[PDB]
Amino acid sequence: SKDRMVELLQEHFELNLYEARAYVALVAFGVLTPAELASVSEVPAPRTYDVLRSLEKKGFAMTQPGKTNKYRPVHPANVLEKFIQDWQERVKEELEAKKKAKEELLELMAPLIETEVPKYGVERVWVVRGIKNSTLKTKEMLEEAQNEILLADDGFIAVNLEDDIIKAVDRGVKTKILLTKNLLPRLKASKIIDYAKEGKLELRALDKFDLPMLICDEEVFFALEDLAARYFNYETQVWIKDHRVVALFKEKFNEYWEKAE
Amino acid sequence: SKDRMVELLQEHFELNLYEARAYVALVAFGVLTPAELASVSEVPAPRTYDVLRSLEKKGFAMTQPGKTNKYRPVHPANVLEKFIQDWQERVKEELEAKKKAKEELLELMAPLIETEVPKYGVERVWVVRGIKNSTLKTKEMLEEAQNEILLADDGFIAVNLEDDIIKAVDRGVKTKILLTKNLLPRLKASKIIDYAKEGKLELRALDKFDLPMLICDEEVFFALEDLAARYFNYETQVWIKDHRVVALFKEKFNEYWEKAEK
Amino acid sequence: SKDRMVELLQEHFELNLYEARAYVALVAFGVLTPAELASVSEVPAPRTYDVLRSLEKKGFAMTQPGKTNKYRPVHPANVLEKFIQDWQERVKEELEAKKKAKEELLELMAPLIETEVPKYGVERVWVVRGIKNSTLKTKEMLEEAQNEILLADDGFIAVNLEDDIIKAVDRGVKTKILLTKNLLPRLKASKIIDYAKEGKLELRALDKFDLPMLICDEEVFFALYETQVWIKDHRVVALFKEKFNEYWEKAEK
Amino acid sequence: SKDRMVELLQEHFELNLYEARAYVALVAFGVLTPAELASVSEVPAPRTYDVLRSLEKKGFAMTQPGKTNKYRPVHPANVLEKFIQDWQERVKEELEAKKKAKEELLELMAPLIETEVPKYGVERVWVVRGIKNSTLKTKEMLEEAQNEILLADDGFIAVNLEDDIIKAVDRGVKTKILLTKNLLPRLKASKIIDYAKEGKLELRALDKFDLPMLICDEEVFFALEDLAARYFNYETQVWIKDHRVVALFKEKFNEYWEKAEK
Ligand SMILES: [Ca+2]
Ligand SMILES: [Ca+2]
């Protein structure tokens, strides 16, 4: 039918509905004026000029300017052939455009991938309040740690996060536990001291240290103090996930750590 | 520079605005959740799930089974290349789709173009817009030329239809071709050229003539060349069937022909 | 009041409605959570987090990430000044960008003004059918002509479009009329014959020429029912002018 | 490239797609009617009138003497220039409008910020996103600093707050400023120099340090500098009021402070 001709033109040769209808009409009727097209095909009267003019510019028609414009269809074997050839040239050009878009993006995104160290998630600073949230944060750090754990403990930490601490030790995590000497005998029946003696974790003590902390693989979790927080009672703590901050707290742990035993 | 990365992704790798922004963000941050994407980029919050999900689909993002779904970028060199490879295969399918369509159209139109009847010949003047569309008419002139052919070509009139020019030559049609010197390079070696060397047509060249044309038996096709209209593919070209007018253009051709060299 | 504060923030400091309301709220209350904001101001509850976070990235707020997200206003005198300083610098870069865009446009559009082929955007080819339309197009040209008129007339043009021909002559237009001897005596009581002798126009005749035409300053109107073609182009017209000058030679009196 | 001309007009001279296209068309063809514009350009037929009329309003098009159906372009050199002149003045108009608005807001807020408590300040930790927003906090630190200032600045932390730094020095604040070497060209105006030259503060420079900071008495503001988070203006910065943390950063500052010369 003629319907199939309209579809094919619309689908593959970039004509809109009216343009496809008008071109088919031109093939069938030869010379048409916009007025005649109106009566010949299914194209709105105010569009018949607009449409035929488009087909002209698209290479599907030729014309005779005048008070009344006459239009002539370009033979299908020419315009359909020409289109595919012109189409193929656009394609080939675009391919090059994409590979140059490719290279330019690679150049532009090298700055985003060059820093091969700090690839943490967005959330790197997290403020923790209260006892419940505190132990929940400490649990996670212990759950996620895979390389090392450094703990300076004046808590309220070894008890009862013991079962999380030992679990990490059981996973081969290089554990070091430093705690206040005054709090030492609290662990006299702990699992930690057994692992300390067997021993897969090292444990030491110190009369009192000023800056307690938990370090877990490029993460540090420490508490602010000012100055009756303990047993009065309220907690304010800060979590940071960044090698550079951890390096500071790790250097300090190692200063506290070398107070052997 | 970020804006450029978004532009390039959007125009050439078929990402929309938010998809392009999100992909850059994934590359930059290494890993994002829909919540984190909302936080760092200009993708609206409720849109961030679908954006990351579509990037995954398109091959720009990578994730784990879930539901603990975090999204991470696939390295650009392994995506932009893969996109192009996919695009090329999509093209090849459309190309043949067009070939199939063309042939069905020609078969459907066969009853319309045969015994059409075609109603032209009585029309002795037509206008063709777009200098690049000239071969939609000059092809027909060469098909029906049976006495003589005079061609003064800038590259846009009738050269490139060599098979039709030569068929005319081979059926005894007298042919004179005048080229601009800028066509002497692109028209090597060639097929049209060796006909001139064999003496089957005459071929000469001239620095520049201001009025290109194709004359085919009491018919003339000529271009009103203008480089300001060239930008809008809207140069006026005219076909006239009138030996008196053709005579005018034929005299002028012969004037250029005198200046024309070897 | 705060209604005025919200208005000003939206109009000049590029906050949306909810953001302006939320910042004002922060100034008033110091520390707020998204939940607290919801109860304090007219910001939709589910929008309160997004808004506060937006203010965070926009420099209007500071925060404490947590289960309890706290937000703190940046002092008005700092963020409002900070905005204007940054705004003013963004502008100047754009200023430079506009002057660089201008320069590139002038270079790109040079081919559009350099290719000095001074024609109109109007079409240059016009097909005319029928006599009434023919005489109107002919009338038009004669009135449009400003330099010269060349007419080879075996019509039915000079008769009777005379008043348009002489009107052109009266305007100082260089008129030359060639007409067929066979219809020549029709003009023996015309104004054209008077103007030919006075003479403000040159007039000759010839019993037969093959290509009649009207030329009016790089415009030509000639005939192929009857179908006529008008062309507006220097190079094409030159051919028709060359032919006119061949027919032009010569005749009395 | 026509497309480039449309882009530039569209991006910088506030023309929409159809207006920008039409202007190029006017430039190319010299004079157009709405009908003529529709035919040559990609502006839809029914739109060519309002498009041309609006170009006239904007100063890009001119009506012709006589019957005004035809439009002619106003030459680019007299429009693109005139636009910039108008735009600059329009900008300036808004600049003063913003400053005025600022001034009104501050007086409106005076009951909240004048003789302020403030309700915040008891809080000993805050986070600032965007390294370029850091001076919204560090300014406050410099204002209240009365013991010492230790500044290791990559350019975005506090060095661009000269008025407050100088004021601090003038009240006896021990001030050490450490800059990256790429800031020395631009900071030779200046206040910090001559104060470094007069011996009122110490100024050293260093190729690069990994942890920018501002220490003011018992407070530290430090940046987790990270490109390409900067690309999305989302670098995480932290303010802590706690002499123990400050001490760590103070040790590290003194580490950066060594070797750095000039
Ligand atoms: Ca402030
Ligand atoms: Ca202040």
Side-chain angles (χ1 to χ4, degrees), chain A residues 64-70 123 125-129 132-133 234, chain C residues 64-70 123 125-129 133 136 227:
Chain A
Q64 288 183 0
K67 286 169 63 171
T68 301
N69 289 2
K70 289 187 171 187
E123 175 54 40
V125 176
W126 196 263
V127 177
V128 179
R129 296 174 180 275
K132 181 177 179 179
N133 289 332
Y234 181 72
Chain C
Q64 289 180 359
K67 182 181 181 180
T68 301
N69 289 316
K70 290 188 172 187
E123 177 56 41
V125 175
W126 197 262
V127 177
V128 179
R129 297 174 182 275
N133 289 332
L136 288 171
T227 302

mmCIF file of all heavy atoms in Angstrom, chain A residues 64-70 123 125-129 132-133 234, chain C residues 64-70 123 125-129 133 136 227:
data_model
loop_
_atom_site.group_PDB
_atom_site.id
_atom_site.type_symbol
_atom_site.label_atom_id
_atom_site.label_comp_id
_atom_site.label_asym_id
_atom_site.label_seq_id
_atom_site.Cartn_x
_atom_site.Cartn_y
_atom_site.Cartn_z
ATOM 1 N N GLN A 64 9.166 25.396 -8.698
ATOM 2 C CA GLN A 64 9.014 26.585 -9.529
ATOM 3 C C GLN A 64 8.409 27.711 -8.697
ATOM 4 O O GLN A 64 7.193 27.758 -8.515
ATOM 5 C CB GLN A 64 8.116 26.335 -10.745
ATOM 6 C CG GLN A 64 8.706 25.473 -11.840
ATOM 7 C CD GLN A 64 7.769 25.344 -13.031
ATOM 8 O OE1 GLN A 64 6.669 25.903 -13.035
ATOM 9 N NE2 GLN A 64 8.193 24.595 -14.045
ATOM 10 N N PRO A 65 9.250 28.616 -8.177
ATOM 11 C CA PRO A 65 8.739 29.759 -7.413
ATOM 12 C C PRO A 65 7.756 30.616 -8.213
ATOM 13 O O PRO A 65 7.926 30.799 -9.418
ATOM 14 C CB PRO A 65 10.006 30.550 -7.073
ATOM 15 C CG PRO A 65 11.100 29.553 -7.124
ATOM 16 C CD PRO A 65 10.721 28.594 -8.208
ATOM 17 N N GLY A 66 6.729 31.121 -7.536
ATOM 18 C CA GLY A 66 5.709 31.941 -8.165
ATOM 19 C C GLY A 66 4.651 32.329 -7.152
ATOM 20 O O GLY A 66 4.820 32.077 -5.959
ATOM 21 N N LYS A 67 3.564 32.944 -7.605
ATOM 22 C CA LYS A 67 2.456 33.220 -6.702
ATOM 23 C C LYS A 67 1.892 31.881 -6.232
ATOM 24 O O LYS A 67 1.523 31.724 -5.067
ATOM 25 C CB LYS A 67 1.387 34.075 -7.395
ATOM 26 C CG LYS A 67 1.794 35.539 -7.567
ATOM 27 C CD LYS A 67 0.848 36.318 -8.479
ATOM 28 C CE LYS A 67 -0.563 36.407 -7.916
ATOM 29 N NZ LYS A 67 -1.419 37.340 -8.706
ATOM 30 N N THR A 68 1.817 30.928 -7.155
ATOM 31 C CA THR A 68 1.539 29.530 -6.836
ATOM 32 C C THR A 68 2.762 28.675 -7.179
ATOM 33 O O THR A 68 3.135 28.565 -8.347
ATOM 34 C CB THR A 68 0.299 28.999 -7.568
ATOM 35 O OG1 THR A 68 -0.839 29.796 -7.220
ATOM 36 C CG2 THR A 68 0.024 27.558 -7.161
ATOM 37 N N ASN A 69 3.388 28.081 -6.167
ATOM 38 C CA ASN A 69 4.563 27.229 -6.369
ATOM 39 C C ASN A 69 4.215 25.816 -6.845
ATOM 40 O O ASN A 69 3.333 25.159 -6.294
ATOM 41 C CB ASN A 69 5.383 27.110 -5.078
ATOM 42 C CG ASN A 69 6.119 28.386 -4.723
ATOM 43 O OD1 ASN A 69 6.013 29.398 -5.416
ATOM 44 N ND2 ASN A 69 6.909 28.329 -3.657
ATOM 45 N N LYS A 70 4.902 25.371 -7.895
ATOM 46 C CA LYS A 70 4.769 24.003 -8.382
ATOM 47 C C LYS A 70 5.955 23.207 -7.872
ATOM 48 O O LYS A 70 7.076 23.714 -7.845
ATOM 49 C CB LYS A 70 4.734 23.945 -9.908
ATOM 50 C CG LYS A 70 3.473 24.475 -10.554
ATOM 51 C CD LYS A 70 3.514 24.199 -12.049
ATOM 52 C CE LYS A 70 2.195 24.508 -12.733
ATOM 53 N NZ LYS A 70 2.206 24.067 -14.160
ATOM 54 N N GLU A 123 31.665 9.999 52.846
ATOM 55 C CA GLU A 123 31.653 10.177 54.292
ATOM 56 C C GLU A 123 32.968 9.819 54.980
ATOM 57 O O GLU A 123 33.252 8.640 55.195
ATOM 58 C CB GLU A 123 30.521 9.337 54.887
ATOM 59 C CG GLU A 123 30.491 9.342 56.386
ATOM 60 C CD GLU A 123 30.454 10.741 56.928
ATOM 61 O OE1 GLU A 123 29.746 11.595 56.352
ATOM 62 O OE2 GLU A 123 31.132 10.976 57.938
ATOM 63 N N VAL A 125 34.152 12.041 57.774
ATOM 64 C CA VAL A 125 34.086 12.585 59.135
ATOM 65 C C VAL A 125 32.711 12.355 59.750
ATOM 66 O O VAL A 125 31.705 12.799 59.203
ATOM 67 C CB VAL A 125 34.434 14.082 59.130
ATOM 68 C CG1 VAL A 125 34.286 14.683 60.527
ATOM 69 C CG2 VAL A 125 35.842 14.288 58.601
ATOM 70 N N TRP A 126 32.683 11.779 60.949
ATOM 71 C CA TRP A 126 31.432 11.352 61.574
ATOM 72 C C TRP A 126 31.491 11.592 63.077
ATOM 73 O O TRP A 126 32.381 11.088 63.759
ATOM 74 C CB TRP A 126 31.180 9.866 61.265
ATOM 75 C CG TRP A 126 29.772 9.343 61.498
ATOM 76 C CD1 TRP A 126 29.312 8.685 62.607
ATOM 77 C CD2 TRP A 126 28.664 9.391 60.582
ATOM 78 N NE1 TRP A 126 27.991 8.337 62.441
ATOM 79 C CE2 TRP A 126 27.574 8.757 61.204
ATOM 80 C CE3 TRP A 126 28.496 9.916 59.298
ATOM 81 C CZ2 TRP A 126 26.323 8.645 60.590
ATOM 82 C CZ3 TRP A 126 27.255 9.800 58.689
ATOM 83 C CH2 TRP A 126 26.187 9.169 59.334
ATOM 84 N N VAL A 127 30.553 12.389 63.581
ATOM 85 C CA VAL A 127 30.490 12.713 65.004
ATOM 86 C C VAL A 127 29.540 11.746 65.708
ATOM 87 O O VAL A 127 28.414 11.526 65.260
ATOM 88 C CB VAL A 127 30.050 14.180 65.230
ATOM 89 C CG1 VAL A 127 29.925 14.484 66.718
ATOM 90 C CG2 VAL A 127 31.030 15.138 64.577
ATOM 91 N N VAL A 128 30.012 11.175 66.813
ATOM 92 C CA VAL A 128 29.252 10.180 67.563
ATOM 93 C C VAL A 128 28.952 10.687 68.971
ATOM 94 O O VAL A 128 29.831 11.209 69.656
ATOM 95 C CB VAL A 128 30.010 8.842 67.615
ATOM 96 C CG1 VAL A 128 29.230 7.818 68.418
ATOM 97 C CG2 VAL A 128 30.276 8.326 66.208
ATOM 98 N N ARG A 129 27.703 10.522 69.394
ATOM 99 C CA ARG A 129 27.261 10.971 70.711
ATOM 100 C C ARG A 129 26.593 9.856 71.510
ATOM 101 O O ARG A 129 25.836 9.056 70.960
ATOM 102 C CB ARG A 129 26.290 12.140 70.563
ATOM 103 C CG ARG A 129 26.910 13.379 69.952
ATOM 104 C CD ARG A 129 25.863 14.444 69.692
ATOM 105 N NE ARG A 129 26.444 15.643 69.098
ATOM 106 C CZ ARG A 129 26.998 16.630 69.798
ATOM 107 N NH1 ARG A 129 27.065 16.562 71.123
ATOM 108 N NH2 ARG A 129 27.499 17.685 69.171
ATOM 109 N N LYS A 132 25.543 4.271 73.634
ATOM 110 C CA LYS A 132 25.043 3.286 72.679
ATOM 111 C C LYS A 132 25.682 3.432 71.301
ATOM 112 O O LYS A 132 26.214 2.471 70.748
ATOM 113 C CB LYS A 132 23.526 3.403 72.529
ATOM 114 C CG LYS A 132 22.939 2.385 71.560
ATOM 115 C CD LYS A 132 21.429 2.482 71.479
ATOM 116 C CE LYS A 132 20.871 1.481 70.480
ATOM 117 N NZ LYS A 132 19.387 1.548 70.394
ATOM 118 N N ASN A 133 25.634 4.644 70.759
ATOM 119 C CA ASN A 133 26.185 4.920 69.439
ATOM 120 C C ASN A 133 27.683 4.657 69.418
ATOM 121 O O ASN A 133 28.235 4.202 68.418
ATOM 122 C CB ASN A 133 25.890 6.362 69.026
ATOM 123 C CG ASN A 133 24.423 6.589 68.715
ATOM 124 O OD1 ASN A 133 23.714 5.670 68.306
ATOM 125 N ND2 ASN A 133 23.961 7.817 68.906
ATOM 126 N N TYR A 234 28.315 12.218 79.883
ATOM 127 C CA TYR A 234 27.992 12.390 78.468
ATOM 128 C C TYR A 234 29.220 12.296 77.561
ATOM 129 O O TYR A 234 30.316 12.719 77.923
ATOM 130 C CB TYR A 234 27.289 13.728 78.243
ATOM 131 C CG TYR A 234 26.909 13.960 76.804
ATOM 132 C CD1 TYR A 234 25.868 13.252 76.222
ATOM 133 C CD2 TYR A 234 27.595 14.880 76.026
ATOM 134 C CE1 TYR A 234 25.518 13.455 74.905
ATOM 135 C CE2 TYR A 234 27.252 15.092 74.708
ATOM 136 C CZ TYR A 234 26.213 14.377 74.153
ATOM 137 O OH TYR A 234 25.869 14.585 72.839
ATOM 138 N N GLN C 64 27.684 18.574 61.740
ATOM 139 C CA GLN C 64 28.251 17.440 62.457
ATOM 140 C C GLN C 64 27.625 16.158 61.923
ATOM 141 O O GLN C 64 26.556 15.758 62.382
ATOM 142 C CB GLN C 64 27.989 17.554 63.959
ATOM 143 C CG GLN C 64 28.784 18.635 64.653
ATOM 144 C CD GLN C 64 28.495 18.702 66.139
ATOM 145 O OE1 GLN C 64 27.672 17.948 66.657
ATOM 146 N NE2 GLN C 64 29.165 19.615 66.832
ATOM 147 N N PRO C 65 28.290 15.497 60.961
ATOM 148 C CA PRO C 65 27.714 14.252 60.440
ATOM 149 C C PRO C 65 27.501 13.203 61.533
ATOM 150 O O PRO C 65 28.371 13.014 62.382
ATOM 151 C CB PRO C 65 28.763 13.782 59.422
ATOM 152 C CG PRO C 65 29.495 15.023 59.028
ATOM 153 C CD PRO C 65 29.529 15.872 60.259
ATOM 154 N N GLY C 66 26.355 12.531 61.503
ATOM 155 C CA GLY C 66 26.036 11.517 62.493
ATOM 156 C C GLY C 66 24.618 11.001 62.338
ATOM 157 O O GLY C 66 23.933 11.340 61.373
ATOM 158 N N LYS C 67 24.173 10.171 63.278
ATOM 159 C CA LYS C 67 22.764 9.800 63.333
ATOM 160 C C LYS C 67 22.006 11.068 63.673
ATOM 161 O O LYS C 67 20.882 11.286 63.222
ATOM 162 C CB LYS C 67 22.476 8.709 64.360
ATOM 163 C CG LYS C 67 21.008 8.300 64.360
ATOM 164 C CD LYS C 67 20.691 7.230 65.383
ATOM 165 C CE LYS C 67 19.219 6.850 65.317
ATOM 166 N NZ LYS C 67 18.854 5.805 66.309
ATOM 167 N N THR C 68 22.649 11.905 64.479
ATOM 168 C CA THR C 68 22.139 13.231 64.748
ATOM 169 C C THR C 68 22.958 14.195 63.918
ATOM 170 O O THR C 68 24.094 14.525 64.265
ATOM 171 C CB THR C 68 22.271 13.596 66.247
ATOM 172 O OG1 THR C 68 21.544 12.655 67.045
ATOM 173 C CG2 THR C 68 21.768 15.007 66.527
ATOM 174 N N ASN C 69 22.373 14.648 62.816
ATOM 175 C CA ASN C 69 23.031 15.628 61.975
ATOM 176 C C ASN C 69 22.697 16.990 62.541
ATOM 177 O O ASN C 69 21.533 17.385 62.582
ATOM 178 C CB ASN C 69 22.567 15.492 60.527
ATOM 179 C CG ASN C 69 23.098 14.238 59.865
ATOM 180 O OD1 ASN C 69 24.271 13.896 60.011
ATOM 181 N ND2 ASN C 69 22.214 13.501 59.200
ATOM 182 N N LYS C 70 23.725 17.717 62.955
ATOM 183 C CA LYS C 70 23.543 19.069 63.450
ATOM 184 C C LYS C 70 24.041 20.046 62.411
ATOM 185 O O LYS C 70 25.030 19.783 61.731
ATOM 186 C CB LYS C 70 24.284 19.279 64.770
ATOM 187 C CG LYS C 70 23.692 18.532 65.953
ATOM 188 C CD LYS C 70 24.384 18.952 67.239
ATOM 189 C CE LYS C 70 23.701 18.383 68.466
ATOM 190 N NZ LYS C 70 24.285 18.946 69.713
ATOM 191 N N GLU C 123 14.336 34.904 -3.003
ATOM 192 C CA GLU C 123 14.690 33.952 -4.038
ATOM 193 C C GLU C 123 15.121 34.739 -5.281
ATOM 194 O O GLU C 123 14.705 35.883 -5.477
ATOM 195 C CB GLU C 123 13.515 33.010 -4.319
ATOM 196 C CG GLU C 123 13.744 32.019 -5.439
ATOM 197 C CD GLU C 123 14.985 31.168 -5.230
ATOM 198 O OE1 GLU C 123 15.226 30.735 -4.084
ATOM 199 O OE2 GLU C 123 15.723 30.942 -6.212
ATOM 200 N N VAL C 125 15.015 33.263 -8.471
ATOM 201 C CA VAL C 125 14.249 32.733 -9.594
ATOM 202 C C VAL C 125 12.760 32.778 -9.291
ATOM 203 O O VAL C 125 12.316 32.381 -8.213
ATOM 204 C CB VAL C 125 14.677 31.294 -9.930
ATOM 205 C CG1 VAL C 125 13.795 30.708 -11.033
ATOM 206 C CG2 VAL C 125 16.131 31.262 -10.344
ATOM 207 N N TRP C 126 11.993 33.271 -10.259
ATOM 208 C CA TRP C 126 10.562 33.451 -10.085
ATOM 209 C C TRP C 126 9.866 33.158 -11.407
ATOM 210 O O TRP C 126 10.106 33.835 -12.407
ATOM 211 C CB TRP C 126 10.259 34.873 -9.613
ATOM 212 C CG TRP C 126 8.900 35.043 -9.018
ATOM 213 C CD1 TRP C 126 7.779 35.515 -9.638
ATOM 214 C CD2 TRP C 126 8.520 34.749 -7.670
ATOM 215 N NE1 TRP C 126 6.723 35.530 -8.759
ATOM 216 C CE2 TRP C 126 7.152 35.065 -7.543
ATOM 217 C CE3 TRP C 126 9.203 34.249 -6.558
ATOM 218 C CZ2 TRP C 126 6.456 34.894 -6.349
ATOM 219 C CZ3 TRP C 126 8.510 34.080 -5.373
ATOM 220 C CH2 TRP C 126 7.150 34.401 -5.279
ATOM 221 N N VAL C 127 9.002 32.146 -11.400
ATOM 222 C CA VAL C 127 8.276 31.733 -12.596
ATOM 223 C C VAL C 127 6.906 32.401 -12.630
ATOM 224 O O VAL C 127 6.146 32.335 -11.666
ATOM 225 C CB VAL C 127 8.140 30.198 -12.659
ATOM 226 C CG1 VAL C 127 7.330 29.775 -13.871
ATOM 227 C CG2 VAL C 127 9.506 29.544 -12.695
ATOM 228 N N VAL C 128 6.588 33.023 -13.758
ATOM 229 C CA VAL C 128 5.336 33.753 -13.896
ATOM 230 C C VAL C 128 4.482 33.119 -14.989
ATOM 231 O O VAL C 128 4.970 32.816 -16.079
ATOM 232 C CB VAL C 128 5.593 35.242 -14.189
ATOM 233 C CG1 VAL C 128 4.275 35.995 -14.345
ATOM 234 C CG2 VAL C 128 6.445 35.867 -13.089
ATOM 235 N N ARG C 129 3.204 32.921 -14.683
ATOM 236 C CA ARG C 129 2.268 32.320 -15.622
ATOM 237 C C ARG C 129 1.060 33.234 -15.789
ATOM 238 O O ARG C 129 0.580 33.829 -14.824
ATOM 239 C CB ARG C 129 1.838 30.932 -15.143
ATOM 240 C CG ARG C 129 2.980 29.931 -15.068
ATOM 241 C CD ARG C 129 2.544 28.608 -14.457
ATOM 242 N NE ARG C 129 3.656 27.665 -14.346
ATOM 243 C CZ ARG C 129 4.059 26.851 -15.319
ATOM 244 N NH1 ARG C 129 3.454 26.853 -16.502
ATOM 245 N NH2 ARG C 129 5.084 26.033 -15.110
ATOM 246 N N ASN C 133 -0.463 38.425 -14.355
ATOM 247 C CA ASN C 133 0.699 38.259 -13.493
ATOM 248 C C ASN C 133 1.959 38.757 -14.206
ATOM 249 O O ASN C 133 2.844 39.346 -13.585
ATOM 250 C CB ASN C 133 0.867 36.792 -13.095
ATOM 251 C CG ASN C 133 -0.204 36.322 -12.131
ATOM 252 O OD1 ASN C 133 -0.755 37.109 -11.360
ATOM 253 N ND2 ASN C 133 -0.507 35.028 -12.170
ATOM 254 N N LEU C 136 2.158 42.584 -14.198
ATOM 255 C CA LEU C 136 2.422 43.057 -12.843
ATOM 256 C C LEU C 136 3.889 42.867 -12.475
ATOM 257 O O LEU C 136 4.482 43.720 -11.815
ATOM 258 C CB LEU C 136 1.519 42.341 -11.835
ATOM 259 C CG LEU C 136 0.042 42.739 -11.880
ATOM 260 C CD1 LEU C 136 -0.798 41.824 -11.005
ATOM 261 C CD2 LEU C 136 -0.137 44.188 -11.448
ATOM 262 N N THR C 227 4.628 30.682 -20.306
ATOM 263 C CA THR C 227 5.433 30.614 -19.088
ATOM 264 C C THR C 227 6.686 31.471 -19.183
ATOM 265 O O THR C 227 7.493 31.311 -20.099
ATOM 266 C CB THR C 227 5.860 29.162 -18.778
ATOM 267 O OG1 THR C 227 4.702 28.331 -18.632
ATOM 268 C CG2 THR C 227 6.701 29.097 -17.506
#
